[PDB]
Specification:
The complex is a heterotrimer of chains A (90), B (85) and C (15). Chain A is mostly helical. Chain A contains 4 helices and 2 strands, in the order αβαβαα. Chain A has one domain (3-89): Histone, subunit A. The longest helix of chain A is centred in the middle third of the chain and has 28 residues, at 22-49. Chain B is mainly α. Chain B has helices at residues 2-5, 12-21, 31-57, 65-74, 76-82, and strands at 27-28, 62-63. In chain B, α3 (31-57) packs across α4 (65-74). Helices cover 40% and strands 0% of the residues of chain C. Chain C contains 1 helix and no strands. Chain C is elongated. The chains are: A mainly alpha (90), B mainly alpha (85), C mainly alpha (15). Chains A and B meet through α1, β1, α2, β2 and α3 of A and α2, β1, α3, β2 and α4 of B. The structure holds chloride ion (CL). Chain B: The modification N6-succinyllysine is found at residue 80. Chain B: This is Histone H2A type 1-B/E. Chain B: The nucleosome is a histone octamer containing two molecules each of H2A, H2B, H3 and H4 assembled in one H3-H4 heterotetramer and two H2A-H2B heterodimers. The octamer wraps approximately 147 bp of DNA. Chain B: Its main location: nucleus.
Chain lengths: 90, 85, 15
């Protein structure tokens, strides 16, 4: 239904002793959904610009580099590429 | 499980389902939801890190909305990313 | 003075 439990699991890694209120968890869910929609929409247009019928990790990466500022873009690219490399190793 | 193979906590299967259901393209490559789930997880961590720091500076034991607001506004990059949400 | 905050906005409980 939402990302709350996964947000909580990430919270337990970054700040194990810190809780989160129900209202703040609602805001976090709003941020994740908004970022999801922004990247997927941009990857959709890029695949259209490239005359490709499929959204691949190439379009996700390009959307990420163009939508996020500065250091966030660099680290998000590092994290996405690491996940894909682990995933395809398996 | 897809998320475990990618080393992620975020649900790759659901991100895949949401990419397919949203009529973003005709097809979705297997790597696309992995990459995207990884980016969402990282962005979540960065927000919680700074909101968590604000709660601790506030001598508080949990993150509340005011801590998220503080974290976004006082971080140039998160403010650029989310300041319009 | 934190169960007062809990009344206003309850803590997210994963279980
Ligand atoms: Cl792919």
């Amino acid at each position: 239904e939402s990302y709350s439990i996964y947000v909580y699991k990430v919270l337990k890694q970054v700040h194990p002793d810190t809780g989160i209120s129900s209202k703040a968890m609602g805001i976090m869910n709003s941020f994740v959904n908004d970022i999801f929609e922004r990247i997927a929409g941009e990857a959709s247009r890029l695949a259209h610009y490239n005359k490709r019928s499929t959204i691949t990790s190439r379009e996700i990466q390009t959307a990420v580099r163009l939508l996020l500022p500065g250091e966030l873009a660099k680290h998000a690219v590092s994290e996405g590429t690491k996940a894909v490399t682990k995933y395809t190793s398996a | 499980t897809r998320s475990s193979r990618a080393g992620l906590q975020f649900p790759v299967g659901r991100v895949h389902r949401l990419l397919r259901k949203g009529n973003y393209s005709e097809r979705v490559g297997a790597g696309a939801p992995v990459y995207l789930a990884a980016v969402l997880e990282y962005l979540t961590a960065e927000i919680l890190e700074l909101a968590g720091n604000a709660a601790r500076d506030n001598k508080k034991t949990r993150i509340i909305p005011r801590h998220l607001q503080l974290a976004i506004r006082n971080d140039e990059e998160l403010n650029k990313l989310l300041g319009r949400v | 003075g934190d169960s007062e905050s809990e009344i206003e906005d309850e803590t997210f409980n994963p279980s």
